[PDB]
Nucleic acid binder design. Structure first.
Ligand SMILES: [K+]
Ligand SMILES: [K+]
Ligand SMILES: [K+]
Ligand SMILES: [K+]
Ligand SMILES: [Mg+2]
Ligand SMILES: [Mg+2]
Ligand SMILES: [Mg+2]
Ligand SMILES: [Mg+2]
Ligand SMILES: [Mg+2]
Ligand SMILES: [Mg+2]
Ligand SMILES: [Mg+2]
Ligand SMILES: [Mg+2]
Ligand SMILES: [Mg+2]
Ligand SMILES: [Mg+2]
Ligand SMILES: [Mg+2]
Ligand SMILES: [Mg+2]
Ligand SMILES: [Zn+2]
Lengths: 123, 56, 204, 35, 150
RNA sequence: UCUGGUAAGGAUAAGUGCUGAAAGCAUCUAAGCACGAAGCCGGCCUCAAGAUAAGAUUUCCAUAAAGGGUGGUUAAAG
RNA sequence: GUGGUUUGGCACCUGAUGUCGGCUCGUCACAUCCUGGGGCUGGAGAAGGUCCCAAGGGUUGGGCUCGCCCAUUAAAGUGGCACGCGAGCUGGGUUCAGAACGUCGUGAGACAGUUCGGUCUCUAUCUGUUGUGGGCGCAGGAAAUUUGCGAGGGUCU
RNA sequence: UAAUUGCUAAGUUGAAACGAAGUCAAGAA
């Protein structure tokens, strides 16, 4: 049973899963849109949006707490600069997931996840 | 552990009754005019729900 | 007789004489009479009741016409009850004050679902052997299922693995602690089957 | 009450419900069944 | 090629002579009446009887509750059945069948004097048993029959 | 942690009786009538109309969202 | 006389019908251990003895290996199911190759004997059983609420 | 579901020593 258990293990050990989520968060912050499997993107949406909410308080404390998740200097700089400037005044829902198709090698369901403020044609 | 008898052609086909290939869920593009998977970005034009999503 | 209800949760109260009691809170709520069944037309006497208000977006046209005949707003859950001590017309309301004089009630619900379960959890099987002392791979195994070539079969009713829970269960003789008609609330002593939000049948 | 294959007789022999009885209300230690 | 030129003709679905008859069970014995009813249903009284065709009569039995069982059979005949589970043998009586309904007793007796195949399973549906003398079978014009003549 | 098993509704077993011939006496029995068991059939709980004997009652009836399927967000359901 | 549960008699089935006890899971019978209803007593009551009706449910944990003992319990029943059950378990016992003692034999070796050690294979086809779906039928197409032909469970003290 | 004459009331029907004798029939003292 898994009644009211609310995160995906993603077929990995806990340390591997946390490392992969941190890497995906850094990749999404650096390149504003990335392509990945649907399940991984849905886990990343849970993981990464509380991290973007921490940039609404530009302090040393919030920078350090964000760095505890990220451990990436360039990602931290971009996130507390341009990403924060763009996602100010948006009350959550910073990301969007759109499905695209299937892979040749394993028929994995594919999608891309992006930040809604860096897509112009989607208003 | 071991089949006592070999199966007849009829028995084999009766089991294989329920083997089938799933039909994809295809929607028509009202503007573009082609097939794409429902709830999925139309890869020919890159549009999704009337808005451009993937810029060629 | 009885009404429909929705289980909210559990709490603990202190009685008048200083006894700690575990209580279940049930929102019994107003139930409307949607159909009346007769010996002369249906073959038995019963009252059909509807419980939770539904919008037109979620009501099929046959159900909408069925409610329109009784002149009531559409409901979400219907159930029949029997042996009412009185006469009740089509489209009238019953509330939790119906249970004000009652001392004990019976609660019918659907238990929580466990999915596929083995013999140890489903039936309390002892398990084969010990965890050590030569155990190979039968720790949670059923053991023997028959008695050799004289029956030469497994009997019907043999206890095996399978789906557990998610089925109708009745609990009888739950003491009523308090009735709150201002909130449509009923407090009973003990536990009722099901998860929070599940629909119950409360029989007087 | 004594049950035996051969029952024999102031005791009186009666037949009740397809069974044979030898009864004596004066002395109840002589009742017999299943003649 | 056919060198016979003198054959016996079998009746078929388009050549049978099916009729509705009404018989009474006022004081008859259960088995003795049901044997004649089985003959009527099978079609042994028709000169064009064909064992592979439903060529009999549709029989309506009236006054079914007035049937007679001699001796102590009403409670001394023990019918046995099995539910399929261990320790699952059960007993019942013609009195139990009569309490449930006369049609059940009559159907149980007639199925047992009928052939044990698909045709007999089809034939048993041509029998209609009613407790009283009132039944509703218009548009077919059933013919009264004296079962004591047979 | 709460709840339950419980009585005996009906027919009875072994036994206890009433009236009573055969056999003018007697007799619980052959025509009859009272009882009398954790045992039998029920009451209680769950499943149950493929019960092909396929039952009943209310309401609606073809294309949009009369009914559905495919799809999506998901669940104390799996 | 009955039974076939003891010791036997017979030799009819068997290019393998492959193993004692214990564990697990049962199911059945009654020749009743407890609980229920009774007749008799050399039955005053109190418990006892014997017989009849009755198989629904129950019928412990240890020190030892059929039986004895310790402490309980209302009670710690008797049997059948390939001495139920190893394509479900174990491997203490038992058919194996090493070794030792006693006894027997000139010897190789043997034994109503004893003792230490000593591989338990198989991905479930059919049937069986526990769960869960698809199709069609009933029925011209449906959404709901239901009756109960029957089935199973419950029944201790 | 023939005809005629009897017997069985146990659904007997389609295993013994040993007990009542349930019932019909034939007798003798
Ligand atoms: K969280
Ligand atoms: K068998
Ligand atoms: K054995
Ligand atoms: K039952
Ligand atoms: Mg895994
Ligand atoms: Mg680590
Ligand atoms: Mg397949
Ligand atoms: Mg569940
Ligand atoms: Mg264990
Ligand atoms: Mg091992
Ligand atoms: Mg292991
Ligand atoms: Mg010979
Ligand atoms: Mg062979
Ligand atoms: Mg085996
Ligand atoms: Mg050696
Ligand atoms: Mg060693
Ligand atoms: Zn398009």
């Amino acid at each position: 049973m898994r009644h009211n258990k609310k995160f995906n293990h993603l077929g990995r050990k806990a340390a591997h899963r946390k490392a992969m989520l941190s890497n995906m968060a850094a990749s999404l912050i650096l390149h504003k849109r990335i392509f990945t499997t649907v399940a991984k993107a849905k886990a990343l949406r849970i993981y990464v949006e509380p991290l973007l909410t921490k940039t609404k308080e530009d302090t040393t404390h919030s920078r350090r707490i964000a760095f505890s998740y990220l451990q990436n200097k360039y990602a931290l700089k971009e996130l507390f600069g341009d990403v924060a400037a763009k996602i100010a005044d948006r009350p959550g829902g910073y990301t969007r997931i759109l499905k695209t198709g299937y892979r040749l090698g394993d028929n994995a369901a594919m999608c891309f996840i992006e930040l809604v403020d860096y897509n112009e044609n989607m208003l | 552990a071991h089949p006592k008898r070999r199966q007849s052609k009829t028995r084999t086909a009766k089991r294989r009754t329920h083997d089938k290939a799933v039909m994809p869920t295809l929607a028509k593009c009202p503007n573009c005019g082609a097939w794409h998977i429902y709830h999925t970005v139309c890869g020919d034009c890159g549009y999704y729900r009337g808005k451009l999503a993937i810029e060629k | 007789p009885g009404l429909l209800g929705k289980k909210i949760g559990m709490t603990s109260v202190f009685s008048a004489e200083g006894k700690n009691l575990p209580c279940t809170v049930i929102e019994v709520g107003p139930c409307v009479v949607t159909q009346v069944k007769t010996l002369e037309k249906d073959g038995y006497s019963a009252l059909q009741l509807g419980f939770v208000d539904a919008k037109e977006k979620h009501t099929t046209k046959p159900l909408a016409g069925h409610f329109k005949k009784a002149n009531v707003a559409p409901k979400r859950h219907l159930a029949e009850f029997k042996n009412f001590e009185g006469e009740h017309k089509l489209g009238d309301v019953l509330n939790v004050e119906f249970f004000s004089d009652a001392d004990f009630v019976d609660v019918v619900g659907t238990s929580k679902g466990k999915g596929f379960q083995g013999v140890v959890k489903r039936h309390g099987f002892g398990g084969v052997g010990q965890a050590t002392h030569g155990q190979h791979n039968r720790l949670r195994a059923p053991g023997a299922v028959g008695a050799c070539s004289y029956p030469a079969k497994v009997f019907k009713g043999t206890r095996m693995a399978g789906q557990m829970g998610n089925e109708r269960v009745t609990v009888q003789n739950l003491e009523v602690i308090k009735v709150m008609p201002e909130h449509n609330l009923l407090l009973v002593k003990g536990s009722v089957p099901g998860a929070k939000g599940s629909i119950l049948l409360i029989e007087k | 009450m004594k049950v035996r294959a051969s029952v024999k007789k102031e005791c009186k022999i009666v037949r009740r419900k397809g069974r044979l009885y030898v009864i004596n209300k004066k002395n109840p230690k002589y009742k017999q069944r299943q003649g | 090629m056919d060198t016979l030129s003198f054959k016996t003709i079998s009746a078929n679905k388009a050549t049978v002579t099916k009729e509705w008859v009404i018989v009474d069970a006022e004081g008859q014995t259960l088995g003795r009446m049901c044997a004649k009813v089985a003959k009527l249903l099978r079609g042994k009284y028709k000169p064009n009887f064909t064992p592979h065709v439903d060529c009999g009569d549709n029989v309506i039995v009236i006054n079914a509750d007035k049937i007679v069982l001699s001796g102590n059979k009403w409670d001394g005949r023990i019918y046995l059945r099995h539910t399929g589970y261990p320790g699952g043998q059960r007993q019942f009586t013609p009195r139990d069948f009569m309490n449930k309904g006369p049609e059940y007793l009559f159907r149980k007796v007639v199925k047992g004097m009928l052939p044990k195949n698909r045709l007999g399973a089809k034939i048993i549906g041509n029998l209609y048993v009613y407790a009283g003398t009132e039944h509703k079978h218009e548009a077919q014009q059933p013919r009264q029959l004296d079962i004591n003549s047979l």
